[PDB]
Amino acid sequence: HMLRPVETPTREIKKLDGLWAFSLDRENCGIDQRWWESALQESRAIAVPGSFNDQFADADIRNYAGNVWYQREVFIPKGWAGQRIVLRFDAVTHYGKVWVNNQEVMEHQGGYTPFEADVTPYVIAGKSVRITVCVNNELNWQTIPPGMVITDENGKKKQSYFHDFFNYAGIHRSVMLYTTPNTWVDDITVVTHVAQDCNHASVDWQVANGDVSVELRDADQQVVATGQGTSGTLQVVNPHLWQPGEGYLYELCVTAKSQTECDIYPLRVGIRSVAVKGEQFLINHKPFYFTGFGRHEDADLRGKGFDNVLMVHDHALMDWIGANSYRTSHYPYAEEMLDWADEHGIVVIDETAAVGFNLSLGIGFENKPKELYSEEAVNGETQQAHLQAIKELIARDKNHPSVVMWSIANEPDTRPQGAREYFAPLAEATRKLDPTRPITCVNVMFCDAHTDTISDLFDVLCLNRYYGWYVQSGDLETAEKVLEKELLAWQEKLHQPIIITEYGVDTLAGLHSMYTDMWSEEYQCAWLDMYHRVFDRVSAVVGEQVWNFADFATSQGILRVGGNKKGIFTRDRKPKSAAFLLQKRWTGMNFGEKPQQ
Amino acid sequence: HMLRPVETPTREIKKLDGLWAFSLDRENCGIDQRWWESALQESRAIAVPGSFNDQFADADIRNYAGNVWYQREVFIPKGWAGQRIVLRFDAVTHYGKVWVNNQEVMEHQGGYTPFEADVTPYVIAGKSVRITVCVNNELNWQTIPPGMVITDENGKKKQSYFHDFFNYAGIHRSVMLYTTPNTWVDDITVVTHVAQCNHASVDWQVVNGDVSVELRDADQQVVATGQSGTLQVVNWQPGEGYLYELCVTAKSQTECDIYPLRVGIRSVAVKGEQFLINHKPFYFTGFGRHEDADLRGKGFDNVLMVHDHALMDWIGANSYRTSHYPYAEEMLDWADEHGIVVIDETAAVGFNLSLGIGFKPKELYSEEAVNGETQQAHLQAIKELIARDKNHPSVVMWSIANEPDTRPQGAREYFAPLAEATRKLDPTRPITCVNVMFCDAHTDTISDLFDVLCLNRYYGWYVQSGDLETAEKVLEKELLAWQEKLHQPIIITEYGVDTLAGLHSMYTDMWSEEYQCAWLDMYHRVFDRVSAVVGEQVWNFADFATSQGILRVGGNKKGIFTRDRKPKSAAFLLQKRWTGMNFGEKP
Ligand SMILES: CCCCCC[C@@H]1NC[C@@H](O)[C@H](O)[C@H]1C(=O)O
Ligand SMILES: CCCCCC[C@@H]1NC[C@@H](O)[C@H](O)[C@H]1C(=O)O
């Protein structure tokens, strides 16, 4: 049971603020020598939140595999003698184990979701405790995402993985201590139903030794509904709906009264209905059309570290270009992202970190498990770890009205028997963990309409298609034919709504061509344009998401010229020519509505 | 009187949690309608700290001149009923006025220094107060740095100024709320002396409480102790940078307050052709810098500081100049705490009307331009810099201004009071004023009111363009001319050439990486031949944003690094020189 921290009977002191002591451990003696005991040797200042790889311009820190130590002292605020205090890590990429002054208090696997522990017994209010963090950036076959650690003859660990983006690690987001009353709200769940768009209710179901009443206050803070019951309610309402263009928010505030002290938790709600009918995706009983991007949490110097200016600027760009939706590509994003999405009515495809369950999308000319689904590779523990990743993503983003669909994985290889054996239970478990949202699994190119094995276990079909790029390279005529043929094949086979969640081409900013050859800005424009002409001719396609909003870092190889260049913007957010192409189509269309051509 | 908040009896909650409501005021009715009354509407989220220009990819926000509105609520923590609580803005670039629920708690002019006010009478602990800030980015002749606003025919403002870097504005740094005990230290002053194995550290810990001071070590084990005033003997170097800690106890019987403040034991002084740190002949190596970065403008960011310091350490720089304004206080904590030599400078740039582009007041020193009010604001800006960076050991010299025009009559009236007054505002640090190329040896009027004079020279770039043999001859002859003409130590605070990353040439044509390399090598060979100059700082460390014009290809491109911090070929050239010399000792 987890909620995002906020105010009044609750209060934060964040240690996000500032520089920590940081150290490597090339021989992994930190645990043996109990480094959490003393203040570190060999410590250098590092900034949190932020990846550790790019911060020191050193290829050895950058390419490190192992454990790293983050440590900082802090003064525990003194008006906190009688309240309950928690230590919350909003993300520690891959694995983290924390000591609060010689006392292990938490441990976590999963680099993208928050994890907290009550630390009341282990701290002296009014004085300073020392926080030590042990961070592991290693991936094996039971981590979400999977990878393999390669140890050379000399014990240097080098991490290989099967996804594009670079394996940035560290404390990527918020680290804070926050206090709730000893009687406190611990979890909230809100569900919205709507009929003729002027007439429904907000079911609730709450959970910590406190009798609870909930007021549903206005944007004007005018109250229009009231309930009581730990097992919640159905507050019935005639309302203004949370819509894609505007995203209205009521405020449902839950009051947890114990007979002495009280706690109250403010939770914003968007009144909207999501469903799939035939080949139509409907938000509030109207067929929506998705436009926008796959994104990444990547940026210069800070890696995957959260940054407010970046969020403000990237939403300004996305707003300008006319995007209405995005997918949290290949891991759960910072919650600040989803909060922004709620206030602005941005439609979001929420996705777990389950990427790389595929051993066919390689560079060439170089020792893998020859069976993807097996005891050596993706096995039962992997499945359990995956289900737990689904449970953490859902427990954190269930109430967000902007999250409109759950993505279980991205681009697994579905051809082997055992893909369906691995995925079907996860598809079912996910539906039972949130029956109010449709479910998806993003589908790779070579698992075509004929060969794919699991897409009928999901509500929406999300395709990643690169005809004319990785195959039929340079050939816009042939690729157009292939793309039309496979889209009609998919619509014939499943009669589900189709979103093209990935389509894009590597483009060097400033490379121009009078031909329309690959890597050129002219080719990025003509290729996106040919895709758009096809989408507009297939009734089932309800959504387009250009593969990347910006250029991002990847591991080194012959396929990646300083990373992935499929961005519409450069890594410093400057637009390639295709940006204006996109802006013309996406602002020239009626909002949320499929282009009539 | 100023110092940075810390936490043992005092406590901060920073409102730097960035997202504030933000709005323009294009018809300038915000003050009239008292927008601080209600929450701003027609408001959009903005990140604090950070400049407001570049955050929104909007050219109308970017080039705006006027007032902008920043607003955020905060819940004042309830364990704060009896202490004194202050609202601290570490910097609001150019002008700021704060309302804490209607009570206009402050004002500040001067965009690079902090300003704080006690807000206890106007705050109820346990609930949220509404914070409204009005920041103005406009410049006149009475501002630091100076500028002129011209209004076109339709009431549209265009802000013109005379310094290179772009006029970024907004809440550039920390906004923190911090609570002290009701008898509290308000200021600290420390001075260190050292002889040629032993010496003393004066203090003056201006507070309502008796004073006791502990000098704890890095072990925080005691080495001297006192009880306003001291002078203590003992029994901080560039490569290493040690720091002791004096802890101040303001002892009262009603309540107690304590302040921890770091100190560096080192001595700086000049004569002959030598600048000596702890009685040792220094050589400055390093950079002119800027607080500039993508999307955030001049906004402070910790990752940027960690990365840029990794870069300067790798390349072999031991020093930098806080070019054209006072930097982040955290900059100087890093420099003290890492032993970086810092030439500290105020925001006195653009006092010159002579090298703009081609294609205005007709005398610079007069009431129309540089007037008496300008004298006041300049003196006050010098004094705010002095009050905030007085205790920092890394500061090794103070820069009163950068690149004024000294040729018009009257420069010496404006300047003499500021040099006398500033020397009188700290005799423990030497003073300089950076002078432009065209005020050469024969022409310059004021180089003798300062302890060291710092030259910005660009021969072979703006003059003798491409002519590197001829430029060599000029640089050598006027360098020797300066050495004979004042026999002061000389630091070269600026030398660099615009270099487009990826432009390469089999000739050595301007704007090319080969040209930057060849030009820097020729300059370096030139200095190796003048006993007098004790400091080299390549002009800019990274490419930075400027206002638009035919001289600036998407900004200034003189950086050794690009704006995304990638090295040009010259970066390695510099590394070879600065790694190949013995530390602090020039060939
Ligand atoms: C032949 C199949 C090619 C799949 C390649 C498409 C990949 N999908 C996942 C994304 O994270 C990658 O960046 C994308 C790519 O490589 O740019
Ligand atoms: C004839 C030109 C005289 C030198 C003027 C050179 C200028 N000095 C001041 C710095 O702020 C500028 O960045 C520098 C430049 O080039 O960008």
DSSP assignment string, A133-177: EEEE----TTSSS-EEEEE-TT--EEEEESSSB----EE-S-EEE
Eight-state DSSP code of residue B153: T
State the Cα–Cα distance between residues B53 and B159, nearest whole angstrom: 14
Smallest Cβ distance to A301: which of B46, B58, B304?
A: B304
User: Which of B296, B303, B314 lies at the smallest CB-CB distance from A55?
Assistant: B303
Half-sphere exposure of residue B25, counting CA atoms within 13 Å on the CB side? 20
Instruction: Using CB atoms, pick whichever of A19, A78, A312 lies closest to residue B302.
Output: A19
CB B71 within 8 A of CB B21: yes
The number of CA neighbours under 13 Å toward the Cβ of A515 is 6
Pair (A311, A268) in one structural domain:
no
Closest CA to B93 of B157, B1, B159: B159
Spell out which chain A residues touch chain B, with contact meaning CB-CB distance below 8 angstroms.
7-8, 11, 13-14, 17-19, 45-47, 50, 54-58, 75, 77-80, 128, 300-302, 305, 307-313, 316-317, 320, 340, 571-573
Q: Beta A250-257 vs A211-217: how paired, if at all?
A: antiparallel
Q: How far is the CA of A174 from the centre of ligand 1 (A)?
A: 30
| Contact across the interface for B295 and A18, Cβ inside 8 Å | no
B217, B150: one domain: no
Alpha carbon distance B267, A131 (integer Å): 37
Which residues face B546 on adjacent strands?
Answer: B165
Q: Cβ contacts of residue B7 below 8 Å, gap of 6+?
A: A75, A128
Q: Is A533 exposed, middle or buried (0-12, 13-18, 19+ CB in 10 A)?
A: middle
Q: How far is CA A462 from CA A341, A351, A439, A496, in A?
A: 21, 12, 10, 10
DSSP B199: -
CA distance B410 to chain A (A): 45
- A324 part of a folded domain: yes
Q: Which of A274, A295, A319 is where one domain is finished?
A: A274
Three-state SS for A337?
Answer: helix
Same domain, A376 and A477: yes
CA B235 to chain centre: 34
- Residue-level length of chain B: 587
Burial class for B548, CB neighbours closer than 10 Å (0-12, 13-18, 19+): exposed
> Tokens for A102?
């010689």
A524-528: long-range pairs with CB below 8 Å, 24+: A524/A576, A524/A577, A524/A578, A525/A577, A525/A578, A525/A581, A526/A476, A527/A468, A527/A469, A527/A476, A527/A479, A528/A503, A528/A504, A528/A578, A528/A581, A528/A582
Q: Concatenated DSSP letters for B16-43? A: TS--EEEEE-TT--TTTTTTTSSPPSS-
Q: Exactly one of A116, A411, A486, A521 is catalytic; which is it?
A: A411
| CATH number for position A531 | 3.20.20.80
Q: Compute CA B242 distance to the chain's CA centroid, rounded to the nearest angstrom.
A: 23
Out of A57, A309, A317, name the one closest to residue B310 (CB).
Answer: A57
Q: Are B544 and B559 in contact (CB under 8 A)?
A: yes
Task: Give the SS3 label for residue A357.
Answer: coil
Q: Which residue of A has its CA nearest to B13?
A: A13
Same domain, B363 and B240: no
Residues 6+ apart with CB under 8 A from A557: A363
Q: Is A536 exposed, middle or buried (0-12, 13-18, 19+ CB in 10 A)?
A: middle
Instruction: For residues B472 and B501, state if they share a domain.
Output: yes
Judge whether B587 lies within some domain.
no
Q: Which of A62, A300, A302, A344 to mutate to test the interface with B (most CBs of B within 10 A)?
A: A300
3-class DSSP state for residue B568? coil
Q: For residue A83, what is the nearest residue in chain B, using CA coordinates?
A: B79
Backbone φ and ψ for A223, nearest 5 degrees, come out as: -80, 140
Inter-residue contact B135 to B95 (CB < 8 Å): yes
Q: A541 and A499 in contact (C-beta within 8 Å)?
A: yes
Strand residues in A458-525 grouped as ranges (E): 460-464, 498-503
Q: Work out the number of other CB atoms within 10 angstroms of the CB of residue B409.
A: 10
- Chain B residues within an 8 Å CB radius of A129: none
Cα A113 from Cα A115, distance rounded (Å): 7
Q: What is the pairing mode between strands A44-47 and A147-151?
A: unpaired
What does the alpha-carbon distance between residue A322 and residue A341 come to, in Å, rounded to a whole number?
14
Q: Would you say B334 and B87 are in contact if contact means Cβ atoms under 8 Å apart?
A: no
Beta strands in A24-114 (DSSP E): 44-47, 50-51, 67-75, 84-89, 95-100, 104-109
In whole angstroms, what is the distance from residue B536 CA to residue B524 CA? 9
Strand segments, DSSP code E, in B114-272 are: 115-118, 128-136, 147-151, 157-161, 170-171, 175-180, 189-192, 201-204, 210-216, 222-226, 230-232, 244-251, 256-263, 268-271
Cα–Cα distance for residue pair A521/A508, rounded to 1 Å: 7
Alpha-carbon distance A56 to B314, whole Å? 10
Is A297 in contact with A306 (CB distance < 8 Å)? yes
- What are A249's two structure tokens? 């928010």
The helix or strand, by DSSP H or E, that contains position B573, with its residue range, turns out to be: helix B569-580
Q: How far is CA A527 from CA A268, A507, A570, B511, in A?
A: 41, 11, 18, 35
For residue A303, give the DSSP letter. B
Show the 3-state SS of B453-496.
EEEECCECCCECCCCHHHHHHHHHHHHHHHHHHHCCCEEEEECC
* Chain A nearest-CA residue for B58: A316
Of A162, A180, A198, the residue at which a domain comes to its end is A180
The verdict on B316 and B329 lying in the same domain is yes
Please report whether residue A265 resides in a domain: yes
d(CA A550, CA A244) in angstroms, rounded, equals 23
Cα–Cα–Cα angle for B565, B345, B420, rounded to 5 degrees: 170
Close Cβ partners of B586 (under 8 Å, ≥ 6 residues apart): B283, B285, B527, B528, B534, B536
The Cα–Cα gap between B84 and A566 comes to 54
Helices (H), A322-450: 335-344, 380-397, 419-433
Q: How was this structure determined?
A: X-ray
Q: Which residue of A has its CA nearest to B8?
A: A75
Distance spanning both ends of chain A, measured CA to CA? 47
CATH number at residue A67: 2.60.120.260
**Distance from the Cα of residue A516 to its chain's centroid:** 35
Cβ separation B306–A46 shorter than 8 A? yes
**Residues in the ligand 1 pocket, defined by CB under 6 Å:** A 164, 330, 361, 411, 444-446, 464, 466, 470, 502, 564, 566
- What is the number of the ligand closest to the CA of B403? 2
Q: Which atom of ligand 1 is closest in space to residue A329's alpha carbon? A: 11
**Residues of B within an 8 Å Cβ radius of A:** 7-8, 11, 13-14, 16-19, 45-48, 50, 54-58, 75, 77-80, 126-128, 294-296, 299, 301-307, 310-311, 314, 334, 563-565
In this structure, the residue with its CA closest to atom 14 of ligand 2 is B164
Give every CB contact of residue A502 below 8 A, 6+ residues apart in sequence. Answer: A294, A442, A463, A464, A465, A466, A545, A547
A544 closest CA partner among A564, A528, A520, A567 = A528
On the 0-12 / 13-18 / 19+ scale of CB atoms within 10 A, B100 is buried
**Centre of ligand 2 from the C-alpha of residue B253, in Å:** 57
Residue of chain A nearest B303, judged by CA positions: A47
Q: Could you tell me if residue A507 is inside a domain?
A: yes
Q: Which of A134, A155, A180 is the last residue of a domain?
A: A180
Domain count, chain B: 3
Q: Strands B341-345 and B319-321, how do they pair?
A: parallel
Q: What's the rounded Cα separation, in Å, for the pair A370 and A280?
A: 39
Residue of B nearest to A12 (CA): B13
> What is the C-alpha separation between A194 and A24, in angstroms, rounded?
54
> A33 with A157, same domain?
yes
Q: Which residues of A touch B171 (CB under 8 A)?
A: none
Closest ligand to residue A362's CA: 1
Is the same domain home to B511 and B543? Answer: yes
Output DSSP code: residue A187: -
| Cα separation, B163 vs A389, whole angstroms | 54
When CB atoms are compared, the residue of A11, A58, A309 closest to B75 is A11
DSSP, residue by residue, B229-263: -EEE-----TTT---EEEEEEEE-SS-EEEEEEEE
Cα–Cα distance measured from residue A237 to residue A227, given in angstroms and rounded to the nearest whole number: 12
Cα A314 to averaged position of ligand 1 atoms, centre (Å): 22
What is the Cα–Cα distance from B545 to B554, expressed in whole angstroms?
7
Q: Report CA-CA distances (Å) from A544 to A113, A498, A528, B460.
A: 27, 9, 10, 54
Q: How far is CA A416 from the centre of its chain?
A: 27
Residue A346 is given by DSSP the state -
A47 chain-B contacts, CB cut-off 8 A = 301-303, 305-306
Flag whether B477 is in a domain: yes
Cα B298 → chain centroid: 11
Buried/exposed code over A228-241 (b: 16+ C-beta within 10 A; e: otherwise): eeeebbebebebeb
Distance of CA B45 to the CA centre of its chain: 28
CB A150 within 8 A of CB A159: yes
Are A48 and A16 in contact, with CB atoms under 8 Å apart? Answer: yes
**Nearest in space to A6 (alpha carbons), one of A180, A216, A210, A217:** A180
Which ligand ends up closest to the CA of A560?
1
Confirm whether B37 is a catalytic residue.
Answer: no
Helix and strand numbers, DSSP H then E, in chain B: 8, 31
The answer to whether residues B294 and B438 belong to one domain is yes
Of A464, A472, A558, best ligand 1 pocket probe by most atoms within 8 Å of the beta carbon: A464
Flag whether B539 is in a domain: yes
> Is A58 part of a structural domain of the chain?
yes
Collapsed DSSP state (helix, strand, coil) of residue B267: coil
Active-site residue, selected from the candidate residues A486, A502, A521, A544: A502
Ligand 1 atom with the shortest distance to the CA of A559: 16
Residue B208 near residue B186 (C-beta atoms within 8 A): no
Cβ proximity of B451 and B431 under 8 Å: yes
Question: What is the Cα–Cα distance from A153 to A151, expressed in whole angstroms?
Answer: 7
Gap between the Cα atoms of A93 and A85, Å rounded: 24
Question: DSSP secondary-structure letter at A394?
Answer: H
B304 and B261 belong to one structural domain:
no
* Nearest ligand to residue A412 Cα: 1
Give the count of alpha carbons within 13 A of B561, CB side only.
Answer: 22
Q: How far apart are CA B561 and CA B544, in angstroms?
A: 10
> Under DSSP, is residue A299 helix (H, G, I), strand (E, B) or coil?
strand
Q: Tell me how many degrees the CA angle B430-B431-B437 measures, rounded to the nearest 5.
A: 135
From A143's Cα to the closest Cα of chain B, the distance in A is 28
User: Which site among B127, B300, B307 would you substitute to test the A interface, given the most A Cβ atoms closer than 10 Å to its Cβ?
Assistant: B307
C-alpha to C-alpha distance for A105 and B99, rounded to whole angstroms: 42
What resolution in angstroms does the PDB record give?
Answer: 2.5
Q: Which two tokens stand for residue B225?
A: 């102790």
Q: Can you tell me the distance from the alpha carbon of A37 to that of A69, in angstroms, rounded to the nearest whole number?
A: 12
A174 within 8 A of A88, measured Cβ to Cβ: yes
A416: CB partners within 8 A, 6+ apart: A371, A372, A373
Distances from the Cα of A228 to the Cα of A253, A254, A256, A577, B360, angstroms: 12, 9, 10, 56, 72
**How far, in Å, CA of B7 to CA of A529, rounded?**
58
Task: Tell me, yes or no, whether A237 and A337 share the same domain.
Answer: no
Instruction: Tell me whether residue B3 is in a domain.
Output: no
User: How far is the C-alpha of B266 from the C-alpha of B394, rounded, in Å?
Assistant: 10
Q: Do B564 and A300 touch (CB under 8 A)?
A: yes
Length of chain A: 597
Q: Tokens 């106890």 identify what position?
A: B249
Catalytic residue, from B329, B478, B494, B536: name it. B494
State the Cα–Cα distance between residues B78 and B80, nearest whole angstrom. Answer: 5
Could you tell me if A138 and A159 are in contact, meaning their C-beta atoms sit under 8 angstroms apart? Answer: yes
Domain that holds residue A428: 275-588
Q: Whose CA is nearest to atom 10 of ligand 1?
A: A164
Measure B304 CA to ligand 2 centroid, in angstroms.
24
Burial bucket for residue B208 (CB in 10 Å: 0-12, 13-18, 19+):
exposed
CB-CB under 8 Å, B303 with A47? yes
- Residue-wise DSSP of B321-387: E-TTS---HHHHHHHHHHT-EEEEE-S-B----S-------SSSBSSSSB-HHHHHHHHHHHHHHHH
Helices (H), B93-225: none
Statement to judge: residues B417 and B450 lie in one domain: yes
Partner-chain residue, chosen from B19, B78, B307, that has the shortest CB–CB distance to A308: B19
| Chain B residues closer than 8 Å to A45 by CB | 306, 334
In one-letter notation, the amino acid at residue B485 is K
Active site annotation includes A37: no
Three-class secondary structure of residue A511 per DSSP: coil
Beta partners for residue A147, in sequence order: A161
